[PDB]
Amino acid sequence: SQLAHNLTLSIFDPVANYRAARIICTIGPSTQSVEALKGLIQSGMSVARMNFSHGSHEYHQTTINNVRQAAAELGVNIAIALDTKGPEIRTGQFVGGDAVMERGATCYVTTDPAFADKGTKDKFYIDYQNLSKVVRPGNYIYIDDGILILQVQSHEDEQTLECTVTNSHTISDRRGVNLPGCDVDLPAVSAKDRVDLQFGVEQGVDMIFASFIRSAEQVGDVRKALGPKGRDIMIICKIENHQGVQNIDSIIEESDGIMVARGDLGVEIPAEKVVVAQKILISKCNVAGKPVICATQMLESMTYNPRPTRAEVSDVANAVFNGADCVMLSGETAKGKYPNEVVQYMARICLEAQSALNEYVFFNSIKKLQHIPMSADEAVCSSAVNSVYETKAKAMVVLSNTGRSARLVAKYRPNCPIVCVTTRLQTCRQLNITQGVESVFFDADKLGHDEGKEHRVAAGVEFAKSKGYVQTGDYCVVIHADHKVKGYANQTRILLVE
């Protein structure tokens, strides 16, 4: 039992020689330079996140180029994620950068497009057209992931509403605005979004963080929009609204993964309900064998301070205990004063939580919750992990070209690193949202197709050797197909490493 397991732990228990959890950073003013990115990668960033609700296409293009350059100069593969606007509502530009909203003050909200690039503490734009046909005198308007609330007092004209500032908060350019329980009839994939998705495909991004995913059909709308050229691009659906939680099963089965988008979620549903929602969505994803991200406000105060709060240390550790593949930083890296320090802390907390994490129980729990009969390739993966535990193997090697096999093995949570030897560079990047996997690139162009698997295996074992995971005389569990089978891995072997 967890209780019994807690009594085995100590504060002096030394950490693992590898970290399983992966860290996602959002790139902005604080972190866009090729120098600042190399600091992020060295601190522990695996995924660069571009928020397409800010900046511009030319701005994010610079990010793309800088990330790739910074990564090439460190000799590492780094995933580029495109974060959609989605069916969302945002405020718009303020004069001078920011606007101080003070407790008790009265302001105005206009739907007139003319006020888009000119906004103040007294009058500013909101891009939802039929806002006036939704809110009445007395209702609340939520601003900046619900941190700021405005009470509508009266209707000034056809497009302006008199408001009251309920609490003191400073807001910046284009703030997110939420209308809980209103049924905002914004399209599944907008005319703006279709340009952004077209942009990501052209630039060859690795994954899409799709915003405000409400239905399975909407996920199909994104893939339809992505087109044939970008079908290998991963759709990671963001759950941040009420019906997104309700349709979670059908959403998960359509997606390539999930983000628990707690910022928008923690306003759209009651804040205490986000804990339960997080426990459910993560576990559900773990069972499905699809990457899951815990996001938003995890080390928030480190946007301003060199050290986190006790709650923030706890939050990051528990996301790992929950079973998240990834932990994400937003404003901490986008516009924070300690971008390297924050990612360094996150890695340090992830590694510590992993120490106390009971991967064997994790493995068994997941094993029990799978439909029997399993497919041959899933059974191979499950039983390979079983071998690891029985033999105390110190590394695992998987040949995977699409990433399918590597994620299937990771799904069973062995207590050793998974070394994926892949023939594709996008697979190296894409597996950066999968916990406990390190990729090795095998250039089948110049080195050969390797139909006998021998060369790719030897490359996985050498990687694991050079990382210090295995020594001469250790066991290493190897997964791939035999001489005949194509499409999946039908074979497992335990080999003595030289």
Ligand X SMILES: O=C([O-])C(=O)[O-]
Ligand Y SMILES: Nc1ncnc2c1ncn2[C@@H]1O[C@H](COP(=O)(O)OP(=O)(O)OP(=O)(O)O)[C@@H](O)[C@H]1O
| Residue 26 binding result from ligand Y, Mg ion, ligand FDP, none, given CB thresholds of 5 to 8 Å by partner type | ligand Y
Build a one-symbol-per-residue string for 353-372: x at contacts with K ion by CB under 5 A, - elsewhere. ----x---------------
**By C-beta, is 180 or 452 nearer to Mg ion?**
180
Note if the bond before 373 is cis, omega within 30 degrees. yes
Spot the catalytic one: 85, 174, 214, 238: 238
DSSP 375: P
Q: How many CB atoms lie within 10 A of CB 102?
A: 12
Is residue 238 annotated as a catalytic residue, yes or no?
yes
- The torsion of the CA quartet 416, 422, 425, 428, rounded to 10 degrees, works out to -20
**By C-beta, is 295 or 437 nearer to ligand X?**
295
Q: What is the DSSP pairing of strand 437-441 with strand 475-480?
A: unpaired
Distance of CA 148 to the CA centre of its chain: 25
| Residue 262 binding result from ligand X, Mg ion, K ion, none, given CB thresholds of 5 to 8 Å by partner type | ligand X
Spot the catalytic one: 296, 422, 423, 492: 296
Please enumerate in sequence order all residues whose Cβ is within 8 A of that of 481, keeping only pairs 6 or more positions apart, or say none.
399, 453, 488, 489, 490, 491
Q: Establish if 330 lies at the interface with Mg ion (CB under 5 A).
A: yes
CA torsion sign, 33 to 294 to 326 to 9?
positive
**By C-beta, is 334 or 408 nearer to ligand Y?**
334
| Residue 164 binding result from Mg ion, ligand Y, ligand X, none, given CB thresholds of 5 to 8 Å by partner type | none
Distance of CA 338 to the CA centre of its chain: 21
SS3 content of the chain, % helix, strand, coil (to 5): 40, 20, 40
Collapsing DSSP to helix, strand or coil, 328 comes out as: strand
H helix or E strand, kind and range, residue 253: helix 248-254
**296 annotated among ligand-binding-site residues:** yes
**240 annotated among ligand-binding-site residues:** yes
Spot the catalytic one: 19, 22, 38, 49: 49
Build a one-symbol-per-residue string for 224-263: x at contacts with Mg ion by CB under 5 A, - elsewhere. ----------------x--------------------x-x
**By C-beta, is 261 or 343 nearer to Mg ion?**
261
Shortest reach from residue 166's CB to Mg ion, in Å: 22
Spot the catalytic one: 90, 123, 273, 424: 90
Distance of CA 74 to the CA centre of its chain: 23
Q: Are 405 and 487 in contact (CB under 8 A)?
A: no
Q: What is the DSSP pairing of strand 475-480 with strand 395-399?
A: parallel
Collapsing DSSP to helix, strand or coil, 177 comes out as: strand
**83 annotated among ligand-binding-site residues:** yes
* Distance (Å, whole) CA 63 – CA 56: 11
**By C-beta, is 425 or 485 nearer to ligand FDP?**
485
Q: How many CB atoms lie within 10 A of CB 117?
A: 11
**By C-beta, is 201 or 353 nearer to K ion?**
353
**52 annotated among ligand-binding-site residues:** yes
Q: Establish if 359 lies at the interface with Mg ion (CB under 5 A).
A: no
Build a one-symbol-per-residue string for 436-455: x at contacts with ligand FDP by CB under 6 A, - elsewhere. -----------------x--
The structure tokens listed for 419 are 């070394």
Q: Establish if 310 lies at the interface with ligand FDP (CB under 6 A).
A: no
Shortest reach from residue 452's CB to ligand FDP, in Å: 9
Is residue 49 annotated as a catalytic residue, yes or no?
yes
Question: Site residues (CB under 6 A) for ligand X?
Answer: 238, 240, 261-264, 295-296
Active site residues: 49, 90, 238, 296
Residues that bind K ion (CB under 5 A): 53, 211, 357
Residues that bind ligand FDP (CB under 6 A): 399-402, 404-405, 453, 480-481, 485-489
